[PDB]
């Protein structure tokens, strides 16, 4: 296996660290929406 | 609450129509169904006593 009179290895290894994650951001989401309709009117007794 | 009150006043509202209406009361007196009599010799007589 090759290694020295008491098992050290000649040759050493490599971490390989990872990316890391991302963090997520976050959007305004809208869902457009309209205005509530108009009903039909009645008429008064007084002037303007 | 006043908000509601004036809704209802305006929308509610009816410009009533108006009448006016005379009244004799020696002649409704006169004109009686049950006890129809004279009110002026009634007075005078009411007045003697």
């Known amino acids: 296996?090759?290694?020295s009179i008491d098992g050290q290895?000649?040759?050493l290894?490599?971490?390989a660290e990872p990316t890391d994650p991302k963090a997520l951001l976050t959007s305004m989401v809208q869902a457009s929406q309209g205005g509530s309709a108009v009903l039909?009117?009645?008429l008064s007794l007084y002037r303007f | 609450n006043l908000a509601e009150m004036?809704?209802?006043?305006?929308e509610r509202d009816e410009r009533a129509l108006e009448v006016t209406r005379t009244v004799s009361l020696?002649?409704?007196y006169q004109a009686l169904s049950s006890d129809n009599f004279n009110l002026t010799e009634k007075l005078t007589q009411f007045l003697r006593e």
């Open chain 2, 26 to 28: 020696a002649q409704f």
């Open chain 1, 9 to 11: 290895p000649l040759s």
């Open chain 2, 6 to 10: 004036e809704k209802v006043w305006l």
């Open chain 1, 40 to 42: 039909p009117g009645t």
């Open chain 1, 13 to 15: 290894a490599i971490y």
């Open chain 1, 1 to 3: 296996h090759n290694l």
